[PDB]
RNA sequence: GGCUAAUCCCCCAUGUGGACCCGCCCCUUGGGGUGUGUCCAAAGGGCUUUGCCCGCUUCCGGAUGGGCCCGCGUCCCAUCAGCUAGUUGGUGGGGUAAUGGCCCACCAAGGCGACGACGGGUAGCCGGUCUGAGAGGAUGGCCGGCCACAGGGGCACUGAGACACGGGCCCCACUCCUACGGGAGGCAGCAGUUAGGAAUCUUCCGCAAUGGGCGCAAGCCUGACGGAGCGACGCCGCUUGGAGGAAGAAGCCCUUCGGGGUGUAAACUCCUGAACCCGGGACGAAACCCCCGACGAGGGGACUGACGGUACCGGGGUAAUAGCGCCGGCCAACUCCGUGCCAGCAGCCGCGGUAAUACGGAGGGCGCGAGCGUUACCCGGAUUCACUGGGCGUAAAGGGCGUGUAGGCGGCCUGGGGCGUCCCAUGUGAAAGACCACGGCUCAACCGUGGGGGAGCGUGGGAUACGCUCAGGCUAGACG
């Protein structure tokens, strides 16, 4: 464009909309569970995964992924979002923490336990 | 109506050493005369002089060349690689003293228009003067 | 805390001899005497085209390895130098060189690197008569390195030093053996380390 | 609790009244010059006026009025008489303006 | 009432004084109207006291008024003396 | 320094003011064409001395009304009444760009 | 309702002087001088009381602090296009320290808007900070400057100063006291509780230092402040050892069953000596005061710690925490076993439906290391809003065509001006930060001292090529 046209109008500055409204700006939510289900995968792939209905303490209700192996999650157990999405999974915007309030670390896991909350096993 | 005579002077030099012509008229004026007189100086045409057509008064740029060259493509390096505009109608550009251009690191120049007359980059710095920004040459 | 764990494992790894053992990395026990191959069970196995990456990475390994030092203050010692006036690298190598450990590793009161920052660490090294325990000092030319008067009859620096008998120090240093002074002259040049880094890959390292 | 401040407070009472009965004063003074000046009584408006004036530097004493406000007043006062006087004027007294 | 004193520029367990001139009604690190010395306590250095007199002089003409400590180091420097 | 400014008088509709358009021009801060906008300024006239079309020198000043901080300094030129007309045709323009 | 003191209030006096109306002079907005007329002051207290000290009064000036006004700059939506009644100006008036529709009366009919008025949405602003090669984008926590607010809304009194957080009146909501009439409150001060939340500290020590208030002082106040406490929240420094030690123990790992790995790693040899115990032990602090001298200068000269027996010095002294992510590509690091579209991984591409270097452990490896990963957010990359620095025949993109308004843009020659433009000088650009140098804590982080830098704006001077402008020519454009 002309640059009497950038005068008169101007370039305009590009506005981005947030992939997660755990509202707040919040880091994480704490919330309860709703439902516990299983979900099926998208097209390209095929499993059972265990994602869980939240309300949220912002008023907002989502489902969210819960990671690791086994789950002692149940309908009124009490959570923390965590935030990242499942790419297979339609409308899940959030993960469950484990080891975080209800939520239980993956139980045996050996390897990363910073993700899925399991603390350090202990050998003599 | 030319919009930008000094524009026209610049291009009508481009196309022509593009082509390899020997000469070029363009419509003249003293202030394209001075521009002329410092691309001369400066090496990058033979030099110029005044002519008439038909009546009308022009300036006839003579061009400069490399020599000729070896395998495919014997078409000469050019002397004016680049001529470019800075300061246009509609955008004007004004450099201080302490925001001339180093053109090409210095294998170019940048014609300044100054209230000490029209200068090289080099030669406006050593005056110490500023002013509109005319070409970029190299 | 730096790394603490089997050393000449990094002699290995990086395919070259960067001793930081001091004696036997002399002797033939460096185990880069016929084990020049590196660390685990794919070391013996053969070798895949390092990626530019793997080339400036191992590069600035060697460099950082050698002088023992972590890579938190090697970064900011590297910004640091990149700042100073003068060319990047040789500024580097410079500092590195002016770190007091280093400094009493190059005069001779310890065999090692790593022996030499216990050595300042415990506070048997004194600059200018007085006592620096933290081997991040920096040393301005002009500076004395001494054993300290008290640690002076120490059975390992009398055992060092009457090793350094007739040795030749750094040409950016000079060394009283009879007195356990040093004088730190010059700061060292590119010239005047001998080693086996190019720099320049280093920088290119820190560009991305 | 009980802040001793509280004086304070009790003291800006007494003062507020003693400020309101000086500054009332002064304006129902000047009333009655300005009056007695529509009336054209030479005399008399002059002699309220002189009153008025020296209340009015009296109150600029103390904190009532000081500043410039006393100025301001009484230079009104002086200029609104004056003028409200032509109307066969002859200020006989002329005691309190330059003649 | 103009005034003349020390505000406090060190570290904590490092004290460095600034004399300053400031309006005694602000702060005591904030905004001041010149900066005549500066005075370390612990003396760390040879020069752990400056003053710029001639300055001083000035501040006083026109009536600022020097803390006990400030006027003490203002006394040190000989903004006073007389004879 | 006061500030003087220059400009025509496209308003003498008002009771001893008058209305000044006020050129300026500037290199924009990013693209850098050199921009003209401009101003209208309400200039104090007491006598009534100045008219439309007249190019004066307008002085900042002790406030007036609301409004009505400069006052009309001199008389740069007389009658340039094109410049008044084109104030009054953009004005003309707003009739459209509406409903 | 009664008594009474004062540096509390009031009345004459003196008028240095000042205020005010009117005249005159200069000056030029209400600045200064002057003459007459009217009007205006004060307070006493303490000492060694024949002299000094603390005060009081009118005035001029200084200094510092603020009030008000103007130029310019300061986010998004035009699916917000018209807005406006004290609204725009005037005369007179009220109010104030002071200009002003700031307010009131009367008069005129104006004022603003595509150069974005009005409307809506978000928001304290700045010094700066993060990012970026830069231009730019983003942000304004802490520290400094300014503003605004003190449960919500209005209001004034007192005062040099407030429309006043720990002052007052009223209305509303809330909590508490209540003899049911009526009252009391106001942590966005330091700590602390409670709720909300992913989440944010001690109901500590001290007025020794700096600073502030009152006081002649002695001194009193000071949750400003100076410290200490808790939290790897951030930055910096430091330790978990050093040297020797097998052609290489056992265990675990792979195996072509020849052996390869973990690895000088461990054991062990020798050496230093974190913690810790013992002893000495601070600077920060010399004023205010005292004495000489004249309560000056000068000279001397004694008291005064929270931090804390802490920092530090000296002596003695033990081998004495390692974790976390990752290892298909991007990307540095590979192999067995287990599981078989499962269980699961996943930032994108995409792995897993019997040989899985991508799932799950193990051995080994890489990376960092008192940390390491994750999530959220910002800049980066992204030249993907392109000023630097992009495009529109078929990829997204030429308006269906014209006429022409605002606007943007403008041939050749001469001259005046000097608005843009450029140059010089000067003012300003606080401090802190940033950059440079030197220095102070053993180093650094941190701090001090000094230097340099700087866009922008003010003022003075200068240049005239280009842009502008004014005037005068020209004919190559345009029209005839
Ligand atoms: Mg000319
Ligand atoms: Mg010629
Ligand atoms: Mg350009
Ligand atoms: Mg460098
Ligand atoms: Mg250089
Ligand atoms: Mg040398
Ligand atoms: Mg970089
Ligand atoms: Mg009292
Ligand atoms: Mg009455
Ligand atoms: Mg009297
Ligand atoms: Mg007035
Ligand atoms: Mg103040
Ligand atoms: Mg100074
Ligand atoms: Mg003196
Ligand atoms: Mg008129
Ligand atoms: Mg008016
Ligand atoms: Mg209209
Ligand atoms: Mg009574
Ligand atoms: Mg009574
Ligand atoms: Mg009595
Ligand atoms: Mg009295
Ligand atoms: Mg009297
Ligand atoms: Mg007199
Ligand atoms: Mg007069
Ligand atoms: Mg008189
Ligand atoms: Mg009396
Ligand atoms: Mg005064
Ligand atoms: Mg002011
Ligand atoms: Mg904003
Ligand atoms: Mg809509
Ligand atoms: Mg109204
Ligand atoms: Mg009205
Ligand atoms: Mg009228
Ligand atoms: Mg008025
Ligand atoms: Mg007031
Ligand atoms: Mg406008
Ligand atoms: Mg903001
Ligand atoms: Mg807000
Ligand atoms: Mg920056
Ligand atoms: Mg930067
Ligand atoms: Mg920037
Ligand atoms: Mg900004
Ligand atoms: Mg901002
Ligand atoms: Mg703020
Ligand atoms: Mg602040
Ligand atoms: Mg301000
Ligand atoms: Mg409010
Ligand atoms: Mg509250
Ligand atoms: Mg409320
Ligand atoms: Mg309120
Ligand atoms: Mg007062
Ligand atoms: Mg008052
Ligand atoms: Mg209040
Ligand atoms: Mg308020
Ligand atoms: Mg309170
Ligand atoms: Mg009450
Ligand atoms: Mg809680
Ligand atoms: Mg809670
Ligand atoms: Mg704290
Ligand atoms: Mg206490
Ligand atoms: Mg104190
Ligand atoms: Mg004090
Ligand atoms: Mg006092
Ligand atoms: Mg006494
Ligand atoms: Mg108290
Ligand atoms: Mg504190
Ligand atoms: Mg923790
Ligand atoms: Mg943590
Ligand atoms: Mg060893
Ligand atoms: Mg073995
Ligand atoms: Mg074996
Ligand atoms: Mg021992
Ligand atoms: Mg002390
Ligand atoms: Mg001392
Ligand atoms: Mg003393
Ligand atoms: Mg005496
Ligand atoms: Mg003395
Ligand atoms: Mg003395
Ligand atoms: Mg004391
Ligand atoms: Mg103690
Ligand atoms: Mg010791
Ligand atoms: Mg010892
Ligand atoms: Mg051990
Ligand atoms: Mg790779
Ligand atoms: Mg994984
Ligand atoms: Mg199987
Ligand atoms: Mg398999
Ligand atoms: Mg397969
Ligand atoms: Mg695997
Ligand atoms: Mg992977
Ligand atoms: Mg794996
Ligand atoms: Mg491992
Ligand atoms: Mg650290
Ligand atoms: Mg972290
Ligand atoms: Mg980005
Ligand atoms: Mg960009
Ligand atoms: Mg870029
Ligand atoms: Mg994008
Ligand atoms: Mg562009
Ligand atoms: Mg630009
Ligand atoms: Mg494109
Ligand atoms: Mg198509
Ligand atoms: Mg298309
Ligand atoms: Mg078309
Ligand atoms: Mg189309
Ligand atoms: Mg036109
Ligand atoms: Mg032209
Ligand atoms: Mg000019
Ligand atoms: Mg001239
Ligand atoms: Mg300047
Ligand atoms: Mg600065
Ligand atoms: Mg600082
Ligand atoms: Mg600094
Ligand atoms: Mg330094
Ligand atoms: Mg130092
Ligand atoms: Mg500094
Ligand atoms: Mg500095
Ligand atoms: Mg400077
Ligand atoms: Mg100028
Ligand atoms: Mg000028
Ligand atoms: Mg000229
Ligand atoms: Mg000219
Ligand atoms: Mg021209
Ligand atoms: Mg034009
Ligand atoms: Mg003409
Ligand atoms: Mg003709
Ligand atoms: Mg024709
Ligand atoms: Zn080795």
């Known amino acids: 464009p002309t640059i009497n046209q950038l005068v008169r ?29 299983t979900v099926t995968p998208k097209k390209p792939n095929s499993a059972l995964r265990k994602v869980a209905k939240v309300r949220l303490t912002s008023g907002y209700e989502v489902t969210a992924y819960i990671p690791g192996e086994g789950h002692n999650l149940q309908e009124h157990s009490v959570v923390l979002i965590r935030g990242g999405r499942v790419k297979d999974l ?22 990363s336990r910073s993700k899925y909350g399991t603390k350090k096993p202990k050998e003599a | 109506m030319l919009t930008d005579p000094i524009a026209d002077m610049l291009t009508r030099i481009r196309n022509a050493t593009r082509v390899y012509k020997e000469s070029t008229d363009v419509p003249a004026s003293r202030f394209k005369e001075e521009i002329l007189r410092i691309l001369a100086r400066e090496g990058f045409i033979k030099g110029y002089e005044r002519v008439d057509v038909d009546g009308k008064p022009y300036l006839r740029v ?15 390096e050019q002397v004016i690689h680049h001529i470019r505009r800075i300061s246009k109608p509609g955008r004007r550009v004004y450099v201080g003293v302490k925001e001339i251009p180093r053109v090409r690191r210095g294998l170019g120049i940048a014609i300044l228009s100054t209230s000490k007359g029209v200068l090289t980059d080099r030669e406006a710095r050593k005056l110490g003067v500023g002013g509109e920004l005319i070409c970029e040459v190299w | 805390g730096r790394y603490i764990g089997p050393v000449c494992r990094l002699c290995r790894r990086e395919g070259v001899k960067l001793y930081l053992k001091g004696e036997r990395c002399y002797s033939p026990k460096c185990a880069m005497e016929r084990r020049p191959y590196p660390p685990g069970q794919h070391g013996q196995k053969r070798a895949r085209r390092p990626s530019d990456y793997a080339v400036r990475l191992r590069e600035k390994q060697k460099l950082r390895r050698i002088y023992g030092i972590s890579e938190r203050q090697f ?9 100073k006036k003068g060319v990047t690298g040789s500024v580097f190598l410079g500092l590195l060189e002016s770190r007091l450990d280093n400094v009493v590793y190059r005069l001779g009161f310890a065999v090692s690197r790593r022996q030499a920052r216990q050595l300042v660490r415990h506070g048997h090294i004194t600059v200018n008569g007085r006592r620096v325990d933290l081997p991040s000092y920096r040393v301005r030319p002009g500076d004395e390195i001494a054993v300290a008067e008290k640690s002076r009859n120490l059975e390992l620096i009398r055992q060092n030093l009457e090793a350094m008998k007739g040795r030749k120090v750094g040409p950016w240093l000079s060394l009283d053996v009879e007195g356990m002074k040093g004088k730190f002259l010059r700061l060292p040049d590119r010239e005047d380390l001998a080693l086996p880094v190019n720099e320049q890959l280093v920088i290119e390292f820190y560009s991305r | 609790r009980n802040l001793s401040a509280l004086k304070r407070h009790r003291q800006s009472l007494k003062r507020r009244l003693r400020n309101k009965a000086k500054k009332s004063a002064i304006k129902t003074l000047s009333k009655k010059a300005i009056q007695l000046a529509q009336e054209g009584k030479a005399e008399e408006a002059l002699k309220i006026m002189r009153k008025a004036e020296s209340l009015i530097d009296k109150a600029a004493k103390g904190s009532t009025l000081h500043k410039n406000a006393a100025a301001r ?27 | ?31 001041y109207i010149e900066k005549i010395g500066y005075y370390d306590p612990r003396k760390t250095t040879p020069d752990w006291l400056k003053v710029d007199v001639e300055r001083a002089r000035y501040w006083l003409s026109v009536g600022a008024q020097p803390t006990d400590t400030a006027r003490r180091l203002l006394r040190q420097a000989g903004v006073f003396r007389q004879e | 320094p006061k500030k003087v400014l220059t400009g025509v008088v496209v308003s003498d509709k008002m009771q001893k003011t008058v209305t000044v358009l006020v050129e300026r021009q500037f290199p924009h801060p990013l693209y850098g064409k050199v921009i003209k906008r401009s101003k209208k300024y309400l200039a104090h006239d007491p006598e009534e001395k100045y008219k439309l079309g007249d190019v004066v020198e307008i002085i900042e000043s002790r406030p007036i009304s609301k409004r009505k901080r400069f006052r009309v300094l001199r008389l740069v030129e007389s009658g340039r009444m094109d410049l008044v007309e084109k104030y009054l045709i953009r004005r003309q323009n707003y009739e459209s760009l509406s409903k």
């Not at chain 1, 309030?101 to 050996?110: F, L």
């Open chain 1, 9 to 37: 109008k101007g370039r305009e500055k590009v506005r981005k909309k947030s992939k997660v409204p755990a509202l707040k700006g919040a880091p994480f939510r704490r919330g309860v569970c709703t439902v516990v289900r």
């Open chain 5, 1 to 31: 009432m103009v005034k003349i004193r020390l505000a406090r520029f060190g570290s904590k367990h490092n004290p460095h004084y600034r004399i300053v001139v400031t309006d005694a009604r602000r702060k005591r690190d904030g905004k």
């Open chain 2, 62 to 76: 003579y061009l400069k060349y490399g020599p000729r060259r070896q395998g495919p493509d014997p078409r000469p």
């Open chain 3, 75 to 83: 970064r900011n010692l590297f910004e640091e130098a990149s700042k």
């Open chain 1, 90 to 111: 339609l409308g899940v915007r959030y993960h469950i923490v484990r080891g975080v309030y209800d939520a239980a670390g993956v139980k045996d896991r050996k390897k």
């Open chain 4, 73 to 99: 007043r009484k230079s009104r006062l002086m200029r609104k008489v004056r003028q409200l006087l032509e109307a066969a004027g002859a200020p006989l007294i002329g005691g309190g303006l330059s003649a």
